């Protein structure tokens, strides 16, 4: 069906003039590492770009940022017609003009601030009619190629002349502003966007299909997540990216309207969103309107909720829309809205993780001139509990800082600041430092899902166990066909045990990174927090946010905590079971054996655990993790000094023979102690830095042995029957 017709998918190379294709695809069309291509799309338009090779690209697709996509008048998924074009010769004269609605405010030399560094020996293959976008000066300006000498298209060579009639052009109707929202404006939310897409794909892109297929398209999508996540943002970008109409409904907006006029706006809204369908009616603060819980008091209040349920179902189905909504949590809303037929589909958008926050920052700085010393990653790595918005405001209070110094002290009072100036202004890693430093980091923080930021390189020794872990998790998911071959059902989870500080936790994380799964750590104190408050009900809440994030490894640290608390050794008249541990057994048993959630329980006190968690069907496998041996010790030091100023003369294999009854934790202690000397040095001389030998040998002075030989044996006798 013509191997010159592809499906436009998002891009990996953000450059305005690039369209990536797989290496095997470029061989079927016969194009090299730079062949200028001529792209053809709907609304009878064309564009010229540079083809490249992308491995992550399937032969069935062509990556292209939004500028490209827009100029063709296509949306992700459509069909376009590529074509080599080795006849485009260097242009002569190029007339480009800014668009009034992307300059209101800046003045001066546009040709110097934007245009110039843009084509600066870029040899960009533009066309007559294109609309490229240039960033810089804490903003983005859109230019429309009015006339190119080698019309219609030519390559921009350091010779080609460039005009700027300094008279901004109005925005043409069918020209969506590249200023609006799109998937390129959402960071860290991958798994989520994935789901949401295939959901609205067919219905919002291919209406007709349903005019003939007897299949019902999910009507309602509900978006979870705490305030800031960016539930709304996503919902809008979904519509702008599918061309679908978008009607926003704010919560207090409708609950502010006089009693009676309220049922009016909703009915009125829906009705009007059906008129421009396809569409996404996106309710903002759903819970402010529909929380029909114990909290349901009053006539107005009740009737309002009903008004919706009659409209949620009210979707004549004939109608062609999708109702997206958002809330702070399941319990906020009213159960009636979950009824299979309204908000049947749910998507959680928890806080951002390591890579997330980093991905976000690159989005909110993609317009300002960042300084060399600026370490974007650095920031992402210190903002443990930061939502999307908390990061945005961060860059704002971080740039406003680099402003109250540069052009502010220089001070350029005007009715409109110059653009050359703003492009010269730079924000330094030092300005961001000040941002965090403010009380702005006040980004709420709750239970955290993520990905393990550690590998097996951080785990010294214990190789025999490493592979064993993969035998319980790697095989059951990457070879499920075999597990049926024999019939036996995979173990539900493991239980690490042994002395404290031997990597029982590093293992639980590292194995999850291996399987690229989410990590969920329920630490001892949280088990106790529930235990003391008699709120073991929360346990259920956990297993859900785990199931709502498969693949995952629900991990329980200090599983013995509740026992030690209640006494442990002596204890009381009672026995092994207790309220929190019990609930986790109901959920661990309940939890569908056929899901993708693996439980790992760790304890440095196997001798007090409720023997019910070791029953088959729950935590079958019992794995013992002993202190480090002569070998492991050598690798542990290296693993805990990897990212440190290790002097050359320093002997590691040596210390491995100095210590014996040590655990990873102990060795680690001796390490920092060497560093607490090194920093005590460099800070002393100034008022020269590479941690050396005389440091460690002096750090052996205060060398301990967390694991006492008595206990040493304890685990030998426990790991007798336990084994």
Ligand X SMILES: Nc1ncnc2c1ncn2[C@@H]1O[C@H](COP(=O)(O)OP(=O)(O)O)[C@@H](O)[C@H]1O
Annotated binding-site ranges for ATP: 227-233, 328, 364, 501-506
Q: Scanning residues 175 to 204, which ones bind ligand X (CB under 6 A)?
A: 185-189
Instruction: Give the contacts of 277 (CB within 8 A, at least 6 positions apart).
Output: 245, 319, 320, 321
Residue number of the CB closest to ligand X reads 388
500 lies in the site for ligand X, by CB under 6 A: yes
161 lies in the site for a copy of itself, by CB under 8 A: no
256 lies in the site for a copy of itself, by CB under 8 A: yes
Q: What angle do CA 525, 530, 532 make, to 5 degrees?
A: 90
Q: Report how far residue 458's alpha carbon sits from residue 540's, in angstroms, rounded to the nearest whole number.
A: 33
Residue whose CB is less far from ligand X, 579 or 673: 673
Structure tokens at 373: 């010393």
Instruction: Give the contacts of 176 (CB within 8 A, at least 6 positions apart).
Output: 70, 240
Pairing of strands 93-98, 18-21: unpaired
Contact 498, 607 (CB under 8 A): no
202 lies in the site for a copy of itself, by CB under 8 A: yes
297 lies in the site for a copy of itself, by CB under 8 A: yes
Q: Scanning residues 443 to 472, which ones bind a copy of itself (CB under 8 A)?
A: 445, 471
Which one of residues 89, 116, 329, 479 is an interface residue with a copy of itself (CB under 8 A)? Answer: 479
502 lies in the site for ligand X, by CB under 6 A: yes
Alpha helices in 276-387 (DSSP H): 286-289, 299-312, 354-363, 376-380
Binding residues: 227-233, 328, 364, 501-506
475 lies in the site for a copy of itself, by CB under 8 A: yes
Question: From the CB of 302, what's the least distance to a copy of itself, in Å?
Answer: 7
Q: Scanning residues 303 to 332, which ones bind ligand X (CB under 6 A)?
A: 326
Instruction: Give the contacts of 42 (CB within 8 A, at least 6 positions apart).
Output: 72, 73, 74, 78
Q: Report how far residue 65's alpha carbon sits from residue 74's, in angstroms, rounded to the nearest whole number.
A: 11
Give CA separation, 225 vs 336, 539, 656, in Å: 20, 19, 48
Percent helix / strand / coil, the chain, rounded to 5: 40, 15, 45
The 203-242 contact track toward a copy of itself, x by CB under 8 A, reads ---x-xx-xxxxxx--------------------------
If contact means CB under 5 to 8 A according to the sort of partner, which of ligand X, a copy of itself, none does residue 688 touch?
Answer: none
Which one of residues 669, 693, 697, 718 is an interface residue with a copy of itself (CB under 8 A)? Answer: 669
Q: Cβ–Cβ contacts within 10 Å for residue 195, how many?
A: 12
Strand, coil or helix: what is 305?
helix
Residue whose CB is less far from a copy of itself, 211 or 318: 211
If contact means CB under 5 to 8 A according to the sort of partner, which of a copy of itself, ligand X, none does residue 275 touch?
Answer: none
Contact 138, 422 (CB under 8 A): yes
The 667-686 contact track toward ligand X, x by CB under 6 A, reads -x------------------
Q: Report how far residue 605's alpha carbon sits from residue 583's, in angstroms, rounded to the nearest whole number.
A: 20
248 lies in the site for a copy of itself, by CB under 8 A: no
Which listed range, 11-19, 104-112, 547-555, 631-639, lies at the site for a copy of itself (CB under 8 A)?
A: 547-555
Give CA separation, 511 vs 83, 191, 514, 547, in Å: 47, 20, 5, 18
Q: What is the dihedral of CA 400, 406, 411, 415, to 10 degrees?
A: -50
DSSP 8-state secondary structure symbol assigned to residue 173:
T
Instruction: Give the contacts of 306 (CB within 8 A, at least 6 positions apart).
Output: none
Residue whose CB is less far from ligand X, 124 or 386: 386
If contact means CB under 5 to 8 A according to the sort of partner, which of a copy of itself, ligand X, none does residue 636 touch?
Answer: ligand X
Which one of residues 38, 273, 422, 665 is an interface residue with ligand X (CB under 6 A)? Answer: 665
The 625-664 contact track toward ligand X, x by CB under 6 A, reads -----------x--xx-----------------------x
Give CA separation, 146 vs 82, 131, 502, in Å: 23, 9, 68
Q: How many residues bind to a copy of itself according to rule CB under 8 A?
A: 131
Which listed range, 93-101, 495-503, 544-552, 564-572, lies at the site for ligand X (CB under 6 A)?
A: 495-503
The 67-96 contact track toward a copy of itself, x by CB under 8 A, reads ------------x-----------------
Q: How many residues bind to ligand X according to rule CB under 6 A?
A: 38
Q: Scanning residues 673 to 712, which ones bind a copy of itself (CB under 8 A)?
A: 675-676, 678-680, 682-683, 689, 691
198 lies in the site for a copy of itself, by CB under 8 A: yes
403 lies in the site for a copy of itself, by CB under 8 A: yes
20 lies in the site for a copy of itself, by CB under 8 A: no
Counted residue by residue, the chain has a size of 723
155 lies in the site for ligand X, by CB under 6 A: no
Which one of residues 137, 168, 350, 388 is an interface residue with ligand X (CB under 6 A)? Answer: 388
Q: Scanning residues 409 to 468, which ones bind ligand X (CB under 6 A)?
A: 458-462
Contact 650, 692 (CB under 8 A): yes
Residue whose CB is less far from a copy of itself, 72 or 422: 422
Which listed range, 39-47, 100-108, 117-125, 392-400, lies at the site for a copy of itself (CB under 8 A)?
A: 392-400
316 lies in the site for a copy of itself, by CB under 8 A: no
Task: Label residues 711-720 b or e (16+ Cβ within 10 Å = b).
Answer: beebbeebbe
Residue among 352, 354, 267 at smallest CA distance from 311: 267
Residue among 487, 489, 505, 485 at smallest CA distance from 497: 505
Which one of residues 140, 157, 269, 389 is an interface residue with ligand X (CB under 6 A)? Answer: 389
Give CA separation, 171 vs 102, 135, 174, 179, 265, in Å: 10, 18, 9, 12, 32
If contact means CB under 5 to 8 A according to the sort of partner, which of a copy of itself, ligand X, none does residue 577 touch?
Answer: a copy of itself
> Which residues on adjacent β-strands are paired with residue 21?
53
Which listed range, 388-396, 450-458, 648-656, 711-719, lies at the site for a copy of itself (CB under 8 A)?
A: 388-396
For ligand X, the binding residues (CB under 6 A) are 185-189, 227-233, 326, 360, 363, 388-389, 392, 458-462, 500-506, 602, 604, 636, 639-640, 664-665, 668
């Amino acid at each position: 069906n013509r191997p010159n017709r592809l499906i436009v998918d998002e891009a990996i190379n953000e450059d305005n003039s690039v369209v990536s294709l797989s290496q095997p695809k470029m061989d079927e069309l016969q194009l090299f590492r730079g062949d200028t291509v001529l792209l053809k799309g709907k609304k009878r338009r064309e564009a010229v770009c540079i083809v490249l090779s992308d491995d992550t690209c399937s032969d069935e697709k062509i990556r292209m940022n939004r500028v490209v996509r827009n100029n063709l008048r296509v949306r992700l998924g459509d069909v376009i017609s590529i074509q080599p074009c080795p006849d485009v010769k260097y242009g002569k004269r190029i007339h480009v003009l800014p668009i009034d609605d992307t300059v209101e405010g800046i003045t001066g030399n546009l040709f110097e601030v934007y245009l110039k560094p843009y084509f600066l020996e870029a040899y960009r293959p533009i066309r007559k009619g294109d609309i490229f976008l240039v960033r810089g000066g804490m903003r983005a300006v859109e230019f429309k190629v009015v006339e190119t000498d080698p019309s219609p298209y030519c390559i921009v060579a350091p010779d080609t002349v460039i005009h700027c009639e300094g008279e901004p052009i109005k925005r043409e109707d069918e020209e969506e502003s590249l200023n609006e929202v799109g998937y390129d404006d959402i960071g860290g939310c991958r798994k989520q966007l994935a789901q949401i897409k295939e959901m609205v794909e067919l219905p919002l892109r291919h209406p007709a299909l349903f005019k003939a297929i007897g299949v019902k398209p999910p009507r309602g999508i509900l978006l979870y997540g705490p305030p800031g996540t960016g539930k709304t943002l996503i919902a809008r970008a979904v519509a702008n990216e599918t061309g679908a109409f978008f009607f926003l409904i704010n919560g207090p907006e409708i609950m502010s309207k006089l009693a009676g006029e309220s049922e009016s706006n909703l009915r009125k809204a829906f009705e009007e969103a059906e008129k421009n369908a396809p569409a996404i009616i996106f309710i903002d603060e759903l819970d402010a309107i529909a929380p029909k819980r114990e909290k349901t008091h009053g006539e107005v209040e009740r009737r309002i909720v009903s008004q919706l349920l009659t409209l949620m179902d009210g979707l004549k189905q004939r109608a062609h829309v999708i109702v997206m909504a958002a809330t702070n949590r399941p319990n906020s809303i009213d159960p009636a809205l979950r009824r299979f037929g309204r908000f049947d589909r749910e998507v959680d958008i928890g806080i951002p993780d390591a890579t997330g926050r980093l991905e976000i920052l690159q989005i909110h700085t993609k317009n300002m001139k960042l300084a060399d010393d600026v370490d974007l990653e650095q920031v992402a790595n210190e903002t443990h509990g930061h939502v999307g918005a908390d990061l945005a405001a961060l860059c704002s209070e971080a740039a406003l800082q680099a402003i109250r110094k540069k052009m502010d002290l220089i001070d350029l009072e005007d009715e409109t600041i110059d653009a050359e100036v703003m492009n010269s202004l730079a924000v330094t890693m030092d300005d961001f430092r000040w941002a965090l430093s403010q009380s702005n980091p006040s980004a709420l923080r709750e239970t955290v899902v993520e990905v393990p930021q550690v590998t097996w390189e951080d785990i010294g020794g214990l190789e025999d166990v490493k592979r064993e872990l993969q035998e319980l998790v790697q095989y059951p998911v990457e070879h499920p066909d075999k597990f049926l071959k024999f019939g036996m059902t995979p173990s539900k989870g493991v239980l690490f045990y042994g002395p404290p500080g031997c990597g029982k936790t590093l293992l639980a994380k590292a194995i999850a990174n291996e399987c690229q799964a989410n990590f969920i750590s329920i630490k001892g104190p949280e088990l106790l927090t529930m235990w003391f408050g008699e709120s073991e009900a929360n346990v259920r809440e956990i297993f859900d946010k785990a199931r709502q994030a498969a693949p995952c490894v629900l991990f329980f640290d200090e599983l013995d905590s509740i026992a030690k608390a209640r006494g442990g050794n002596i204890g009381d008249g009672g026995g092994a079971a207790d309220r929190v541990i019990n609930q986790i057994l109901t959920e661990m048993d309940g939890m569908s054996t056929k899901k993708n959630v693996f439980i790992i329980g760790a304890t440095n006190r196997p001798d007090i655990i409720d023997p019910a968690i070791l029953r088959p069907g729950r935590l079958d496998q019992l794995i013992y993790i002993p202190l480090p041996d002569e070998k492991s010790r050598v690798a542990i030091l290296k693993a805990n000094l990897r990212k440190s100023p290790v002097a050359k003369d320093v002997d590691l294999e040596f210390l491995a023979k100095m210590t014996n009854g040590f655990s990873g934790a102990d060795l680690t202690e001796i390490c920092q102690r060497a560093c607490k000397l090194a920093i005590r040095e460099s800070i002393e001389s100034e008022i020269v830095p590479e941690i050396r030998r005389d440091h460690f040998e002096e750090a052996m002075r205060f060398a301990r042995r967390s694991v006492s030989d008595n206990d040493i044996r304890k685990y030998e006798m426990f790991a007798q029957t336990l084994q």
